[PDB]
RNA sequence: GAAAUACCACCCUGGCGCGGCUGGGGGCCUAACCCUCGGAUGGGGGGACAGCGCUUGGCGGGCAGUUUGACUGGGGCGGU
């Protein structure tokens, strides 16, 4: 529950397959949302059930609230 | 209410837009090919077909080459 507090964001594929979390604030540090965006990238990867056969982090990005959409590469 | 509603995110059920891949089929030719003409190496009919080469799957006695046991007061049929 202190997690949930100090900072938790969880995971949950909807009914199709695709995840929802908060990894950076908006005038939040750039190399801050970088970091999130990553931490969320190692445990979404773990997650990652060993019934995948292929692309399995098909489509990863990041949009706003009310705002932009764009995909990121969580490789660079 | 099992869900909440703005406007921005991804993801599907379903139909239409367009584009890269490739599956299905319907039309005279034509120059390879076949038959060709009817008295000439030029004309004629057919022509992308089937002839034919190879690889594919399948009918398949017409053919080939084997096999279709031992016991048991014969063999076999009967038993086993």
Same mark, same amino acid.
Do not use: C, M, Q, W
């Given at each position: 529950?202190?997690? =949930?507090?100090?900072?938790?964001?969880?995971?949950?594929?909807?009914?199709?397959?695709? =995840?929802?979390? +908060? %990894?950076?604030?908006?005038?939040? +540090? *750039?190399?801050?949302?970088?970091?999130? =965006?990553?931490?969320?990238?190692?445990?979404?990867?773990?997650?990652? +059930?060993?019934?995948?056969?292929?692309?399995?982090?098909?489509? %990863?990005?990041?949009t706003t609230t009310m705002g +932009?959409? %764009?995909?990121?590469? *969580?490789?660079?």
């Open positions: 529950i202190r997690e =949930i507090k100090a900072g938790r964001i969880e995971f949950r594929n909807d009914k199709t397959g695709a =995840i929802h979390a +908060p %990894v950076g604030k908006a005038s939040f +540090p *750039p190399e801050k949302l970088a970091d999130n =965006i990553r931490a969320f990238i190692r445990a979404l990867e773990a997650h990652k +059930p060993e019934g995948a056969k292929g692309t399995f982090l098909r489509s %990863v990005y990041v +932009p959409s %764009v995909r990121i590469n *969580p490789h660079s």
